[PDB]
Amino acid sequence: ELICIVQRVNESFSLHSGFGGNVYSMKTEPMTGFTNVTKGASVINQKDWIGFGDSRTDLTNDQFPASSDVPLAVAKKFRSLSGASLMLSAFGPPGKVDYLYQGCGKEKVFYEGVNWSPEAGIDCFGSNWTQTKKDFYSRIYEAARSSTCMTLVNSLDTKISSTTATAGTASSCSSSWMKSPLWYAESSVNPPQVCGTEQSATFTLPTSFGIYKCNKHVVQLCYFVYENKAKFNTFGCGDYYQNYYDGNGNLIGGMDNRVAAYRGIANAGVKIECPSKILNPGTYSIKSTPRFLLVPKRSYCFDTDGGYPIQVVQSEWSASRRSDNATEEACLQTEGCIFIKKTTPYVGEADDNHGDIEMRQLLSGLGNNDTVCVSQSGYTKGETPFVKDYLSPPKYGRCQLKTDSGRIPTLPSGLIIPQAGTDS
Amino acid sequence: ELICIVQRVNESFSLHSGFGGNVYSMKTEPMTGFTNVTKGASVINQKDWIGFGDSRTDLTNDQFPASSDVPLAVAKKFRSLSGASLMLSAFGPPGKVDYLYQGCGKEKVFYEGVNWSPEAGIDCFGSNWTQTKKDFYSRIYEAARSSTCMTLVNSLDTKISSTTATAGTASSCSSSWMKSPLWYAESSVNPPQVCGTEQSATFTLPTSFGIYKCNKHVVQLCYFVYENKAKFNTFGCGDYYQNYYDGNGNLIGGMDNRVAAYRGIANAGVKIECPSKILNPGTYSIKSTPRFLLVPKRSYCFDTDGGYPIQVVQSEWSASRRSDNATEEACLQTEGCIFIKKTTPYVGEADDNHGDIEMRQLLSGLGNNDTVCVSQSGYTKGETPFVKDYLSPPKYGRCQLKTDSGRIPTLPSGLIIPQAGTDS
Amino acid sequence: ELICIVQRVNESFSLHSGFGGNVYSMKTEPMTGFTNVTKGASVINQKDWIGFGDSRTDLTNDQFPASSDVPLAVAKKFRSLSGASLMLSAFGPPGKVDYLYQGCGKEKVFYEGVNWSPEAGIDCFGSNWTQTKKDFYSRIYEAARSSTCMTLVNSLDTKISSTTATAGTASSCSSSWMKSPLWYAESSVNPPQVCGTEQSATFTLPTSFGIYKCNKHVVQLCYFVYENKAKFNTFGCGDYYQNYYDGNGNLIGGMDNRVAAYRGIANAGVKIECPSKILNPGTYSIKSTPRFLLVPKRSYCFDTDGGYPIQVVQSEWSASRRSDNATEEACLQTEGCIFIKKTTPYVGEADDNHGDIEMRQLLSGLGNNDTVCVSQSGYTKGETPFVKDYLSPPKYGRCQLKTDSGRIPTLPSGLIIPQAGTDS
Amino acid sequence: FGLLFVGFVAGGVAGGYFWGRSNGGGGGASVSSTQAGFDKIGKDIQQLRNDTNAAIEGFNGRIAHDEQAIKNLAKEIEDARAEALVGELGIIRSLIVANISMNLKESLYELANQITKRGGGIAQEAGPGCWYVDSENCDASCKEYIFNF
Amino acid sequence: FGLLFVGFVAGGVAGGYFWGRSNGGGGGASVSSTQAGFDKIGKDIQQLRNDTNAAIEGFNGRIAHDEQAIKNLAKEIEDARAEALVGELGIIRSLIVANISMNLKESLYELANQITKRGGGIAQEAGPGCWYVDSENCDASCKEYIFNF
Amino acid sequence: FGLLFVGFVAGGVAGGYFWGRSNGGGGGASVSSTQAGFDKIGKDIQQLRNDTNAAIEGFNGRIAHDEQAIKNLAKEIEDARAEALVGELGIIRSLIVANISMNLKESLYELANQITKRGGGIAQEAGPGCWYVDSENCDASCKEYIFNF
Ligand SMILES: *[C@@H]1O[C@H](CO)[C@@H](O[C@@H]2O[C@H](CO)[C@@H](O[C@@H]3O[C@H](CO[C@H]4O[C@H](CO[C@H]5O[C@H](CO)[C@@H](O)[C@H](O)[C@@H]5O)[C@@H](O)[C@H](O[C@H]5O[C@H](CO)[C@@H](O)[C@H](O)[C@@H]5O)[C@@H]4O)[C@@H](O)[C@H](O)[C@@H]3O)[C@H](O)[C@H]2NC(C)=O)[C@H](O)[C@H]1NC(C)=O
Ligand SMILES: *[C@@H]1O[C@H](CO)[C@@H](O[C@@H]2O[C@H](CO)[C@@H](O[C@@H]3O[C@H](CO[C@H]4O[C@H](CO[C@H]5O[C@H](CO)[C@@H](O)[C@H](O)[C@@H]5O)[C@@H](O)[C@H](O[C@H]5O[C@H](CO)[C@@H](O)[C@H](O)[C@@H]5O)[C@@H]4O)[C@@H](O)[C@H](O)[C@@H]3O)[C@H](O)[C@H]2NC(C)=O)[C@H](O)[C@H]1NC(C)=O
Ligand SMILES: *[C@@H]1O[C@H](CO)[C@@H](O[C@@H]2O[C@H](CO)[C@@H](O)[C@H](O)[C@H]2NC(C)=O)[C@H](O)[C@H]1NC(C)=O
Ligand SMILES: *[C@@H]1O[C@H](CO)[C@@H](O[C@@H]2O[C@H](CO)[C@@H](O)[C@H](O)[C@H]2NC(C)=O)[C@H](O)[C@H]1NC(C)=O
Ligand SMILES: *[C@@H]1O[C@H](CO)[C@@H](O[C@@H]2O[C@H](CO)[C@@H](O)[C@H](O)[C@H]2NC(C)=O)[C@H](O)[C@H]1NC(C)=O
Ligand SMILES: *[C@@H]1O[C@H](CO)[C@@H](O[C@@H]2O[C@H](CO)[C@@H](O)[C@H](O)[C@H]2NC(C)=O)[C@H](O)[C@H]1NC(C)=O
Ligand SMILES: *[C@@H]1O[C@H](CO)[C@@H](O[C@@H]2O[C@H](CO)[C@@H](O)[C@H](O)[C@H]2NC(C)=O)[C@H](O)[C@H]1NC(C)=O
Ligand SMILES: *[C@@H]1O[C@H](CO)[C@@H](O[C@@H]2O[C@H](CO)[C@@H](O)[C@H](O)[C@H]2NC(C)=O)[C@H](O)[C@H]1NC(C)=O
């Protein structure tokens, strides 16, 4: 008698091919899957990141932790002071807190801006501080993406040629003036009879500031904006001009209405514009119309040793105050910048404007020790190489790829029967 | 008795190695091979491309299809008009057809230029329209490679300060003038006694035109060219100049013979040069010598949302007329531009200059629904990952790699015998 | 009776997994390993490289080979002359050897500079020739990385408008002057009563020089440097200026103290600065203060057909003479430049300064026919894909990757036993 | 027909591993049971399946570093990288399936080999998983001892 | 010497699958035929060869997206990509050859197994593709029935 | 228990390939020797090991072209490329180990097959590397001839 183990399959069994053997099975399980994506901010390396912030990350605040959007351990990683902002330190308007932001970290988190919004009501002849704000943070983000470190440079070496010009003051600016730019005006220039002498000045961007190497400086090259020549000529003779030059005499900034049309809004009066530029270290020169001279007195110092794409966190007040989205738009138009944005209003735990539940959730990743990817869609752990939807750039780290679930191959499970040869 | 199946090989059998088993065979067949490459133009995505053309792709032509280098279905994908050309619409010379080119497509096909060749005999004080042509299409191609869309902007907002200057006219320009630039001249400027006042003007490049976002504008910053100061001074006082400025007063274009040497060809008389520049949207300023002012009145609007490398098709007449190869040379010197060139003369079916058999073959790919790669060597289907010769860049899509046929591995065929173990 | 071969393993045996069979073994050997890295210079393709050098690679030297840091076969691949240097040929100072460097090679080796060091005591009103040196070689290296070829252009077509100005001469410059720039001065300009007329000049960078295509020129745009206006006004009227313009009048170089601060070192007297710039071919214009005009008379011609990262070899004297490290610093700050540096003093075989044992070792790779990678860490053969430490960029070729030795997988060796199934 | 072959069956009928018997009166008419006590196969399958984790963990643990400053998705490059990774996953799959196939077959050879050595040598092999047990020396309680049904 | 071995032959002599026989008078002198009616091997080979298309189609269907605006060929990068792809094709090849080898050998085991079960059990296996048929119970018409030559 | 199995042994005790014998008086008590004259295995192992060079040489000969003008190491990109290459080396390893495993096992089947054909057919196979030699027709000098110990 012939006795045999007999191998057989049903219509329920399907065939899976292998290199060196096939398998019959009834069930299949996918070989792998998608990694979840968490909204908000995080870091891939806890030992190399720096945060810059305000009261909402200031552990010295009297109402901490209820006033904070991050816990103690994350707060220690921020350079923050209540009331501060990059832009506030850039100009130093009267009575506002003037914090020296500085630090190093390949990954950077920027969480301020709000302490200079429309709510603060700073005037000082500003044409449009929101526009200035957007342009300023644009230049910061642009320089920071390629830099390891950043520091405020709270005082540039400056020198004015004029011996009669004196330091300007304005009622619209708390009866004093910015820390930067410095405003020098000539009392004797009267259009009467007396036109005055063209004003001159130098300013120096240093090759270093303390322990920080400077390869790049974000500075403002400010100028006055007039409605037309006629309105200008009630203050000075000729056309308004204020031009910025490098050490050779190349025009690098300013406003020259001897060649460029006046663009001052009608009947607004004199206004100041303050575009930010990224400049190399060196000594720069200024030529201005006799009556009014503006001279940069601060900068932000950056190196070019490299960095990762940065993270910018939405910095706005609760609904009760007047906010702007200048840092959002600055971030949006700048390469290598990732923006973290709330979907509900800012409602704080300490006050209206401090300690928001959504923001604490969005920032909680700052946070974790197992983040491997950070992107504009959020951050991931290193579970699988795949995600269900794209991770929007900017992004960096061990970042997952989008594939359809259908393309993920399977393996046989359940009752299994081997097969090889042609069986015929 | 021992009865055995016996396995044996000849000197004709060679051994092929495997991971987990070897194979003896007499014949081998290559595992895969090369994909053919077809010369001419095509697209990898029929649902996202746009063509810009003239009569040779104009389905409204009375002699269609015999006058056409593409069939009806491809023609519907072109924005074309008989007699038109990008450059003709750029300047708008008198009596020439003035078509508003506009459209969107990640893949772009440019098939005109010929309607402004030497044959057309346009003068209008042009120094060298062929040079202007090359420079113009260079800037178009450069901006189009990074753009999703393109539109003519047929009228810029302009403003001249002078209240006495009037609109210039020339016998060499059909007793009228271009649509762009506008020519304003001062009757009263006579070098006698009267020098006149420096002329001024602004022009605005808009942030949008209809439904099209503008991030970039191709415009011409024209100026007059004089042989020397002496020949200039029979028209005006001082040195000739015409300078273009941005809103701050940065010099962005023009010709200034107060600092730059005169370079006018001797005894040619006055000539106009019209280099194209890519400019951001904004309001720009002009300063000119009193007698002659030129002001840009048109542009081409582009976005920066991205595009693929473009395809430019040779646009020349039949042998009977006078052609140029300005668009060829513009394409050659511009990144991301692929040029389609005939190897035999243009011989048309409707006329001499319309409906050429070679061009219809070269354009027939526009065409197909299974093109996966487009390159300067031509286009391919997705048969294999390999080609016999390189695909010259520019190129995009699923593009094949060159390998020697010898490196393509083989598989055993014919009578086959397995082998494993050492057999000893 | 049952007789069986019995398979068994010890505690000394470990299990290795395979796809289609496992293996028990006692020993393991790593599957592959690291490729050694040799310090110094080399090439990946002996048929496409060019060297530029001085006496230390000059086979026509009377003391060859003892005066040489390379053997005969490598020397034939250098364009060298005793006493020569790129910079010496750039300016052509009196009595110094003036070699026409020219050649083609995708890989480039630069081994001079030393024949213009502080030791040579060239003055000629130089502000700081070491600074000039660094800036010059910076521009050479920058242009050479993207070029296939290079040639000295020993004479530019030049033209001065002034009919009274004569060719300058200096006691500090051997009672003559540089070949480049040319110095023209106006005898009659005396600040007495007579200010003189603004000086003008053109110079042309050609589109080719002999068989070499020029897409780029390295030229010096020199100017005089004065301590202040007061010290300048003992020579001329107004402020000092010397400005360089393109054919349209765009300022591309120079020094203009009408807008830029004077920066001359106090009581040093007049000095000349000579920064190098990379310029397109064309005709350029000059405007200068009446008394002193400087005009570029030479350039270095480069194409843009591509090249590999370059190799620059430390070019210094023996300890007895005064050296600089200007070419080191130029190389360090320039992308695509690899620097070869000795670790011991230069001690020669023919003289003190010729035929150094370490340099011959470092250059011996130039040399070999089996180099596949060249990097800032040195060069490798094609043994394995791995190295123990990183190969520092710049680098090119078949370059190895760093992995830890622990990650390199092993294979079973020694007595080996197969295993498959669950064995239970 | 005994471990070198897998046969098909219709609508109803359980799939799996069964006992099949042969001739007798000349000529007989064959017979197939309703699955045995092969719990060793059940355990071997579970072990083999769980052993696939090593190959899968290696793949999951491999994610390429990247860095994009760009603000708009490079969709086609993105998709190309995925496709390559999926292709790599495809090869690994094929290797794992074969690895299960081969090791299961070897586990089935081990099952048959134990059966051979329990009726030694009343069994007499006829290819893997087949035996000529001569119903002379071996009654019914005998074959029950040898083949456990 | 029977399915675990492949032997070599000289100048003439056909290669392939043959019948080989043994002793007799003591000692005999062996003998090898001139190929059998193994059309099952012919069919199995054709099927195995055609089954290679699946692995090849997967490779051909995989072409990486690219985009170059550059005007001059990056020859060395170009060649490097090809070399990697060729390397990948090399591995697949090695897998396919083994896959044919192993499945053909299994098809040959199936051939031998059918022969065993046709002289059951006059056959008596002696390793795959070998049998001790005792020329006592089995004459010549018998062996003809069992081994088809 | 005979070529389909690998068993473990304690502290002392040599690992390798041994001769093991069975019953007798009913019931017997088994016995395992101290390794045989299997020099064929020694030679086959050496050949198999040296054959691994082909797969390794192919891997070593494959180094991707590159070109960096950058002055500071891109460490993370650098490490990612290495990791991928190491991953590729991991797969090749797994293939080579299996390739040795399978070809060694086949070499062991060839060893057993030669032994079968030397006591033909006093041997009688009982799975690979096992035999029922009936101590009736075959004394001791006989088994010595057949199994070389
Ligand atoms: C004082 O200065 C203030 C700052 O300049 C100025 O305020 C600005 O005023 C203008 C005009 O009213 C507003 O213009 C509007 O801008 C929006 C936003 O555009 C930006 O974002 C969109 C995409 O938005 C979509 O997605 C976001 C999420 O990411 C959603 O929230 C949103 O709802 C949309 O669904 C983007 O398309 C825009 O991109 C443009 O610009 C970039 C470059 O910057 C280009 O790359 C791109 O091609 C395109 O041209 C842009 O990034 C826009 O959607 C509207 O159509 C409109 O243009 C500004 O928002 C506003 N900004 C601020 C900070 O307040 C004041 O008007 C001025 N005061 C006075 C008196 O002059
Ligand atoms: C009015 O303006 C007209 C336009 O400026 C002007 O006409 C020009 O005049 C010049 C001088 O006579 C001619 O110069 C010649 O140009 C050719 C072509 O050069 C271009 O192509 C070559 C490669 O050509 C090879 O391959 C092509 C196929 O691709 C073949 O057809 C051909 O036969 C060759 O085998 C290329 O090497 C050139 O590259 C140069 O320029 C680019 C940048 O633009 C650089 O990247 C590169 O390094 C190099 O410098 C170029 O792309 C050239 O081969 C000749 O040597 C010569 O230079 C122009 O062809 C001509 N153009 C037109 C449109 O007519 C008129 O002269 C002027 N009228 C007056 C009175 O002034
Ligand atoms: C290895 O070879 C086998 C046998 O040629 C292939 O098995 C075939 O696979 C297809 C689809 O998977 C089945 O429909 C055929 O019936 C199979 N043929 C046989 C005879 O079983 C197997 O696909 C190959 N392995 C791989 C990964 O390609
Ligand atoms: C898998 O192992 C086998 C056996 O070691 C390798 O077969 C050898 O291959 C070379 C060249 O292909 C032949 O010349 C040798 O004669 C073969 N050895 C034997 C004993 O047959 C096989 O190459 C290995 N597979 C791979 C892909 O490396
Ligand atoms: C192929 O399958 C076998 C069997 O499932 C795997 O062998 C296991 O490997 C682990 C670690 O290597 C051992 O600890 C287990 O004991 C093995 N199981 C058995 C039953 O032997 C093998 O790893 C798989 N091959 C690969 C490369 O994954
Ligand atoms: C083919 O055979 C399988 C098992 O050999 C049958 O699967 C069983 O189905 C029932 C009800 O669906 C389950 O509860 C059992 O757990 C299954 N058995 C196993 C081992 O998984 C299947 O129903 C059969 N299919 C057909 C069409 O008859
Ligand atoms: C080795 O054997 C093969 C076949 O086993 C011989 O191949 C035959 O050759 C003839 C004439 O060349 C062909 O028409 C047949 O079709 C071939 N047979 C097969 C099965 O393909 C081959 O000639 C022999 N080689 C030597 C050197 O004797
Ligand atoms: C397990 O077995 C192996 C061999 O089967 C033993 O290895 C031998 O050890 C001695 C001394 O260490 C060496 O000189 C021999 O060359 C080894 N033999 C072989 C074949 O390599 C090993 O000692 C045993 N291990 C234990 C723990 O008993």
PDB file of C-alpha atoms and ligand atoms in Angstrom, chain A residues 128 130-131 325-326 328-329 332-333 341, chain B residues 213 215, ligand 1:
ATOM      1  CA  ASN A 128       4.051 101.266   7.504  1.00  0.00           C
ATOM      2  CA  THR A 130       3.807  96.106   9.260  1.00  0.00           C
ATOM      3  CA  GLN A 131       5.540  96.300   5.832  1.00  0.00           C
ATOM      4  CA  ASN A 325       0.540  88.218  10.004  1.00  0.00           C
ATOM      5  CA  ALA A 326       3.805  89.793   8.844  1.00  0.00           C
ATOM      6  CA  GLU A 328       3.670  84.419   8.385  1.00  0.00           C
ATOM      7  CA  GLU A 329       4.064  86.205   5.066  1.00  0.00           C
ATOM      8  CA  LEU A 332       5.961  82.022   3.278  1.00  0.00           C
ATOM      9  CA  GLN A 333       8.100  83.957   0.796  1.00  0.00           C
ATOM     10  CA  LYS A 341       0.108  78.197  12.613  1.00  0.00           C
TER      11      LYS A 341
ATOM     12  CA  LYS B 213      -0.048  86.357 -11.826  1.00  0.00           C
ATOM     13  CA  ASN B 215       6.264  87.615 -10.723  1.00  0.00           C
TER      14      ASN B 215
HETATM   15  C1  LIG G   1       1.250  98.022   5.117  1.00  0.00           C
HETATM   16  O1  LIG G   1       2.059  96.887   4.844  1.00  0.00           O
HETATM   17  C2  LIG G   1       1.395  95.632   4.903  1.00  0.00           C
HETATM   18  C3  LIG G   1       2.422  94.559   4.560  1.00  0.00           C
HETATM   19  O2  LIG G   1       2.947  94.842   3.252  1.00  0.00           O
HETATM   20  C4  LIG G   1       0.228  95.600   3.921  1.00  0.00           C
HETATM   21  O3  LIG G   1      -0.504  94.422   4.212  1.00  0.00           O
HETATM   22  C5  LIG G   1      -0.616  93.569   3.081  1.00  0.00           C
HETATM   23  O4  LIG G   1      -1.585  94.080   2.184  1.00  0.00           O
HETATM   24  C6  LIG G   1      -1.832  93.270   1.041  1.00  0.00           C
HETATM   25  C7  LIG G   1      -2.916  93.948   0.203  1.00  0.00           C
HETATM   26  O5  LIG G   1      -4.084  94.110   1.019  1.00  0.00           O
HETATM   27  C8  LIG G   1      -2.277  91.862   1.415  1.00  0.00           C
HETATM   28  O6  LIG G   1      -2.273  91.192   0.150  1.00  0.00           O
HETATM   29  C9  LIG G   1      -2.920  89.924   0.117  1.00  0.00           C
HETATM   30  O7  LIG G   1      -1.999  88.903   0.468  1.00  0.00           O
HETATM   31  C10 LIG G   1      -2.612  87.626   0.522  1.00  0.00           C
HETATM   32  C11 LIG G   1      -1.605  86.669   1.136  1.00  0.00           C
HETATM   33  O8  LIG G   1      -0.672  86.379   0.099  1.00  0.00           O
HETATM   34  C12 LIG G   1       0.375  85.517   0.551  1.00  0.00           C
HETATM   35  O9  LIG G   1      -0.098  84.182   0.733  1.00  0.00           O
HETATM   36  C13 LIG G   1      -0.746  83.671  -0.440  1.00  0.00           C
HETATM   37  C14 LIG G   1      -1.334  82.281  -0.191  1.00  0.00           C
HETATM   38  O10 LIG G   1      -2.405  82.404   0.746  1.00  0.00           O
HETATM   39  C15 LIG G   1      -3.181  81.209   0.763  1.00  0.00           C
HETATM   40  O11 LIG G   1      -2.621  80.284   1.692  1.00  0.00           O
HETATM   41  C16 LIG G   1      -2.541  80.821   3.015  1.00  0.00           C
HETATM   42  C17 LIG G   1      -1.837  79.829   3.934  1.00  0.00           C
HETATM   43  O12 LIG G   1      -0.481  79.686   3.511  1.00  0.00           O
HETATM   44  C18 LIG G   1      -3.940  81.136   3.528  1.00  0.00           C
HETATM   45  O13 LIG G   1      -3.825  81.777   4.803  1.00  0.00           O
HETATM   46  C19 LIG G   1      -4.656  82.085   2.575  1.00  0.00           C
HETATM   47  O14 LIG G   1      -5.997  82.296   3.037  1.00  0.00           O
HETATM   48  C20 LIG G   1      -4.623  81.571   1.138  1.00  0.00           C
HETATM   49  O15 LIG G   1      -5.503  80.445   0.969  1.00  0.00           O
HETATM   50  C21 LIG G   1       0.263  83.603  -1.573  1.00  0.00           C
HETATM   51  O16 LIG G   1      -0.393  83.132  -2.750  1.00  0.00           O
HETATM   52  C22 LIG G   1       0.900  84.963  -1.832  1.00  0.00           C
HETATM   53  O17 LIG G   1       1.966  84.731  -2.751  1.00  0.00           O
HETATM   54  C23 LIG G   1       2.259  85.914  -3.497  1.00  0.00           C
HETATM   55  O18 LIG G   1       3.464  86.546  -3.052  1.00  0.00           O
HETATM   56  C24 LIG G   1       4.624  85.696  -3.076  1.00  0.00           C
HETATM   57  C25 LIG G   1       5.858  86.518  -2.712  1.00  0.00           C
HETATM   58  O19 LIG G   1       5.619  87.272  -1.519  1.00  0.00           O
HETATM   59  C26 LIG G   1       4.846  85.076  -4.461  1.00  0.00           C
HETATM   60  O20 LIG G   1       5.825  84.039  -4.341  1.00  0.00           O
HETATM   61  C27 LIG G   1       3.569  84.499  -5.066  1.00  0.00           C
HETATM   62  O21 LIG G   1       3.783  84.149  -6.441  1.00  0.00           O
HETATM   63  C28 LIG G   1       2.408  85.483  -4.949  1.00  0.00           C
HETATM   64  O22 LIG G   1       2.596  86.638  -5.777  1.00  0.00           O
HETATM   65  C29 LIG G   1       1.440  85.563  -0.533  1.00  0.00           C
HETATM   66  O23 LIG G   1       2.584  84.837  -0.095  1.00  0.00           O
HETATM   67  C30 LIG G   1      -3.014  87.239  -0.900  1.00  0.00           C
HETATM   68  O24 LIG G   1      -3.612  85.940  -0.900  1.00  0.00           O
HETATM   69  C31 LIG G   1      -4.011  88.269  -1.426  1.00  0.00           C
HETATM   70  O25 LIG G   1      -4.419  87.999  -2.784  1.00  0.00           O
HETATM   71  C32 LIG G   1      -3.418  89.668  -1.307  1.00  0.00           C
HETATM   72  O26 LIG G   1      -2.333  89.810  -2.223  1.00  0.00           O
HETATM   73  C33 LIG G   1      -1.313  91.255   2.441  1.00  0.00           C
HETATM   74  O27 LIG G   1      -1.864  90.074   3.018  1.00  0.00           O
HETATM   75  C34 LIG G   1      -1.036  92.201   3.604  1.00  0.00           C
HETATM   76  N1  LIG G   1      -0.012  91.650   4.491  1.00  0.00           N
HETATM   77  C35 LIG G   1       0.063  91.899   5.804  1.00  0.00           C
HETATM   78  C36 LIG G   1       1.300  91.422   6.507  1.00  0.00           C
HETATM   79  O28 LIG G   1      -0.819  92.473   6.416  1.00  0.00           O
HETATM   80  C37 LIG G   1      -0.706  96.780   4.160  1.00  0.00           C
HETATM   81  O29 LIG G   1      -1.731  96.786   3.156  1.00  0.00           O
HETATM   82  C38 LIG G   1       0.076  98.093   4.157  1.00  0.00           C
HETATM   83  N2  LIG G   1      -0.766  99.199   4.567  1.00  0.00           N
HETATM   84  C39 LIG G   1      -0.981 100.211   3.735  1.00  0.00           C
HETATM   85  C40 LIG G   1      -1.931 101.265   4.218  1.00  0.00           C
HETATM   86  O30 LIG G   1      -0.439 100.263   2.645  1.00  0.00           O
END
